[PDB]
């Protein structure tokens, strides 16, 4: 289950098609994408 985060009230929030791009608890518009469990790799340098 992919989700997002409201930038204002910090509530985790998934979003579907035919939805207003808003938070659903506060009415905030700016709504940043959370990070999920996914493999990236690095040299330890």
């Amino acid at each position: 289950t992919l989700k997002y985060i409201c930038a204002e009230c910090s509530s985790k929030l998934s979003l579907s098609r035919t939805d207003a791009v808003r938070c659903k608890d506060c009415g905030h518009r700016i709504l940043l994408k959370a990070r999920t469990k996914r493999l990236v790799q690095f040299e330890a340098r």
């Binding site: 207003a20 808003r22 659903k24 608890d25 506060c26 009415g27």
Partner: protein, 380 residues
């Protein structure tokens, strides 16, 4: 329309099997009655067929299934289970379809939801049509169980049970082919018959004339005038059972008649259980944050120390025990002023009976005129 109307009919029967405990044969009886009216829609000229369905008709083919199984439910216990919103009648479209709602036309869904209650005998006339639309006669056994109707109307108003047999001797007088108070069929015209042809209705004016003639021509001086005033005020008295408070809901809905704005004379406790009923009205009935915040400032509960767990054993008593208050009230059992007190009871027994059966004052007044004037035309 039909795929959803049957589904609202299916959900109304599925309530009665679960909660009012009508048996699992009652589900089958209604399907033939639904299939015989569904075959009726077939036979019409299908272009501008103008099919006749209403929400009054989902009670009828639920009442046509009631007397064929010969159940002691009556139309007083259909006008009550809808007005207290127990089975899906009012707002029958608000929760049921969930997809068919938006792809149905507006006119077909306002009919399909319970916008009004049936009033002034609108419920019987739909039965009289539906008994003519399908042939309920000579395919089913239209014998109305009128004996419990006398028994319930004994228990309605807490009279001695001699009235049960003072009535049934009158019924066995004024009836052609003494038994068989049959449900009336009408398929010929659009005129509602001014006979009061409905056999379930004729029991009332039988019971209204029985309760008068035993008390007016009281030759035995058996029923004293001290008892009459101890019967009227025992009956004209407000109690807080589960069954009378549901009858307070029915007095709310019907606006024309007097004793419809009767809620001013309620008590404290009769209002709390009405508001405790109100938690069964709201369940049938992006800037939603305003109501989300207003319901937070007005929480629906009691704000502290509620009435669920640590309340009592019993405050609210059942239908059997307020009778035992009414019966133990009318202990004295051993004239121009007598008949004035007779009409105290007759008025209070009939105005009680007028809201419980959804008819006008003249709908019952005409039924006195087609019984009393037919009882003496057959006598003399």
């Amino acid at each position: 329309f039909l795929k959803s109307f049957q589904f609202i009919l299916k959900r109304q029967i599925r309530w009665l099997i679960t909660e009012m405990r009508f048996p699992k044969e009652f589900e089958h009886v209604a399907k033939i009655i639904w299939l015989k009216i569904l075959k009726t829609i077939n036979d019409q000229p299908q272009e501008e067929l103008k099919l006749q369905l209403h929400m009054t008709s989902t009670i009828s083919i639920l009442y046509l299934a009631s007397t064929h199984l010969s159940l002691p439910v009556y139309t007083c216990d259909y006008i009550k289970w809808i007005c207290t919103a127990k089975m899906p009648y009012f707002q029958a479209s608000e929760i049921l379809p969930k997809s068919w709602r938006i792809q149905l036309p507006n006119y077909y869904v306002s009919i399909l939801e319970g916008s009004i209650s049936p009033f002034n005998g609108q419920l019987y006339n739909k039965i009289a049509l539906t008994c003519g639309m399908i042939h309920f006669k000579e395919f089913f056994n239209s014998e109305i169980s009128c004996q419990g109707l006398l028994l319930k109307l004994v228990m309605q108003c807490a009279l001695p049970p001699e009235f049960y047999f003072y009535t049934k001797q009158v019924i066995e007088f004024e009836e052609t082919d003494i038994r068989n108070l049959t449900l009336w069929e009408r398929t010929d015209e659009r005129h509602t018959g001014r006979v009061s042809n409905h056999a379930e209705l004729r029991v009332l004016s039988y019971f209204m004339l029985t309760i008068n003639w035993m008390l007016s021509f009281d030759r035995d001086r058996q029923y004293p005038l001290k008892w009459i005033l101890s019967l009227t005020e025992s009956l004209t008295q407000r109690t807080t059972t589960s069954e009378s408070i549901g009858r307070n809901i029915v007095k709310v809905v019907y606006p024309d008649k007097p004793t419809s704005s009767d809620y001013f004379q309620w008590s404290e406790e009769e209002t709390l259980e009405f508001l405790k009923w109100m938690e069964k009205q709201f369940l049938p009935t992006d800037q939603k944050i305003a109501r989300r915040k207003l319901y937070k400032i007005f929480p629906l509960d009691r704000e502290a120390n509620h009435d669920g767990e640590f309340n009592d054993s019993t405050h609210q008593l059942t239908f059997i025990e307020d009778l035992q208050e009414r019966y133990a009230k009318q202990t004295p059992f051993f004239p121009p002023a007598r008949k004035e007190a007779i009409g105290r009871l007759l008025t209070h027994i009939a105005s009680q009976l007028l809201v419980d059966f959804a008819i006008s004052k003249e709908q019952l007044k005409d039924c006195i005129s087609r019984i009393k004037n037919a009882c003496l035309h057959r006598m003399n």
